[PDB]
Design a protein around this ligand. Structure first.
Ligand SMILES: OC[C@H]1O[C@H](O[C@H]2[C@H](O)[C@@H](O)[C@@H](O[C@H]3[C@H](O)[C@@H](O)[C@@H](O[C@H]4[C@H](O)[C@@H](O)[C@@H](O)O[C@@H]4CO)O[C@@H]3CO)O[C@@H]2CO)[C@H](O)[C@@H](O)[C@@H]1O
Length: 585
């Protein structure tokens, strides 16, 4: 076996507690190199004579070139040292420890997970495991209060193609009036884009962190919204913009007027005085040159004290969590203290970070509960939309990521198909709804928290920003209700099938020629297998189905068809059809 591909480290996503007494442990190896992987472990202070415990780690998945093995060590001492025993195809075995590789269990060395602190067991709010979030862009969602409307608001119609500087008058009142809608679709929580006072369309450049923007509403209406959504079983997640403030943020105004005599000069990153927001800048902003968003010095104890208060205030109104704008650009220090705070006020308040890339460092348990899954989005784009990759690559990309973070995180990752910063998935698919549905069908059944982008459920389309911020189509006759009901059913299934929300994922079948991929979600003895035939022609397939998880399954989308004979299941699939098999337990 190629030792150069064997991997594990006693921390991160390869060693982590799922409770105060059990250690989840993972190991990597060249695919097909190791057939059996066992872990020999014992207390860190246990005697050399004492016998070791045994833990058999089956394959939890496999990627483009590696096999991932996963074990669960019962560490009653809450301390543990351990070694790996690896065996190959033709029977060769070898030991793996911190010291290195060896045929002797001694020279292999032993890995060490010092202690397991209860305070360090990664915990996600129970409700987040089985929620289905619906992202709302207020300014472009619903106009329920016309006098809210800001100047230059444009006609609200289907054939409306937004402008970077466009306004449509949608406000919080609009969201309250549409709650009836959301309950029907079945959303569990709403994620609102920034809604505090801001002169912009997106409101990402905050004027007042403590004020609903007038065109969006007022404190009363907000309390009103929270209350009304809650009694409807819908949670509240607001956009927390702590990386940067608006050029109108009171303290920046101070800097813009009193120069160095301002007590707030130290709340931003400024090169040369006086401040010049002309076309260039003498202060650090969001992207490159973006004047309305001077970066905020979150490292400043004072700036931090302020933003937490901003958080306290709004949290006093009953909201349920935060999506953190450009979170990866604010110090972990701030965020670690942040989790400390938020959780202190509400254990179930949800913490969501916005990192469009490997956020493994924030998903260790001390900072975030999840992040919007950048990759899920990409893997789904390449497989369903563009076709840049085949079924087997899908499984690879799909699996490789899962092994990226600790189970607690992956369980809640916000798997979106799109957001306000990208093209809409329908057009992402070249308008092919067929392909589209398969992706939402999958999105709605895979490991993580589904995030519907407002309007997607009605067949709304649009290019990337700002075309993806089109006013929600509210006229039923121009709505894709055919698709709307599709969502209700998939959404419902998620709430009815425990495995789909609290289960693990193991790949079931992957055929590159068929470009057909399937997986199985499991919780206890309940097994739900999802079959995805990504081809414009229908082909039948035979999946390996060992007669122990069942020989009878029901297509929760249509109806029964248990063809398990002599260990396998022959399935004929319609084009771009997906099947969801419930093992009946
Ligand atoms: O004029 C500036 C813009 O300000 C507002 O933009 C928001 C976005 O709507 C938010 O979603 C968010 O997005 C950032 C993101 O945080 C940041 O990492 C960056 O992302 C990269 C990413 O590293 C990478 O995956 C790659 O694919 O490209 C991305 C660039 O698109 O950029 C995102 C968006 O620029 O925060 C910003 C800033 O608050 C406003 O809504 C926009 O309309 C406006 O143009």
């Amino acid at each position: 076996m190629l030792l150069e591909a064997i991997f594990h480290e006693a921390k991160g996503s390869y060693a982590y507690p799922i409770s105060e007494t059990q250690l989840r442990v993972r190991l990597r190896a060249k695919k097909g190199d190791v057939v059996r992987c066992e872990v020999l472990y014992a207390d860190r202070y246990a005697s050399p004579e004492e016998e070791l415990a045994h833990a058999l780690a089956g394959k939890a998945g496999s990627d483009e070139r590696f096999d991932y093995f996963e074990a669960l060590l019962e560490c009653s001492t809450k301390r543990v040292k351990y070694v790996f025993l690896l065996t190959g195809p033709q029977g060769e075995a070898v030991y793996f420890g911190e010291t290195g590789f060896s045929a002797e269990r001694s020279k292999a060395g032993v890995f060490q997970y010092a202690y397991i602190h209860r305070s360090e067991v990664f915990t996600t709010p129970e409700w987040a495991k089985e929620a289905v979030i619906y992202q709302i862009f207020p300014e472009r969602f619903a106009n329920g209060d016309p006098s809210n409307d800001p100047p230059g608001t444009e006609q609200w119609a289907k054939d409306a193609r937004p402008r970077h500087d466009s306004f449509y008058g949608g406000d919080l009142k609009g969201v309250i009036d549409r709650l009836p809608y959301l309950e029907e679709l079945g959303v569990t929580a709403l994620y609102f884009t920034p809604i505090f006072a801001s002169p912009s369309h997106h409101k990402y450049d905050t004027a007042d962190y403590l004020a609903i923007d007038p065109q969006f509403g007022d404190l009363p209406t907000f309390r009103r919204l929270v209350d009304e959504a809650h009694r409807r079983g819908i949670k509240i997640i607001l956009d927390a913009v702590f990386n940067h403030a608006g050029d109108q943020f009171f303290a920046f105004r101070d800097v813009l007027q009193k120069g160095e005599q301002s007590r707030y000069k130290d709340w931003f990153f400024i090169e040369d005085f006086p401040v010049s927001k002309t076309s260039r800048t003498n202060y650090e902003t969001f992207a490159v040159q973006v004047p309305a968003m001077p970066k905020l010095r979150t490292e400043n104890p004072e700036v931090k004290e302020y933003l937490f208060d901003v958080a306290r205030f709004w949290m006093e109104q009953g909201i349920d969590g935060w999506r953190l704008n450009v979170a990866n650009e604010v110090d972990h220090a701030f965020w670690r203290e942040f989790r400390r705070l938020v959780k202190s006020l509400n254990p179930d308040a949800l913490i969501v970070g916005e990192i469009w890339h490997d956020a493994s460092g924030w998903l260790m348990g001390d900072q975030f509960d999840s992040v919007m899954n950048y990759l899920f989005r990409e893997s789904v784009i390449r497989f369903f939309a563009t076709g840049e990759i085949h079924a087997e690559r899908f499984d690879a990309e799909l699996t490789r990521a899962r092994m990226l973070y600790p189970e607690q995180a992956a369980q809640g990752l916000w798997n979106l198909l799109d957001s306000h910063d990208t093209e809409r998935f329908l057009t992402s698919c070249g308008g092919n709804e067929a392909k589209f549905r398969l992706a939402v069908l999958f999105q709605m059944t895979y490991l993580g928290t589904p995030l519907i982008y407002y309007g997607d459920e009605i067949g709304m389309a649009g290019a990337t920003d700002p075309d993806c911020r089109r006013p929600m189509i509210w006229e039923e006759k121009e709505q894709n209700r055919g698709l709307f009901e599709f969502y209700k059913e998939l959404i419902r299934l998620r709430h009815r099938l425990a495995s789909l929300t609290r289960g693990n994922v193991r790949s079931w079948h992957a055929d590159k020629q068929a470009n057909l991929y399937a997986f199985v979600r499991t919780v206890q003895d309940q097994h739900v297998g999802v079959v995805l035939n990504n081809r414009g022609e229908k082909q039948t397939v035979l999946l390996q189905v060992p007669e122990s998880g069942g020989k009878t399954w029901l297509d929760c989308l249509t109806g029964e068809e248990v063809h398990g004979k002599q260990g396998q299941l022959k399935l004929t699939l319609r084009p771009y059809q997906g099947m969801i098999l419930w093992n009946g337990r």
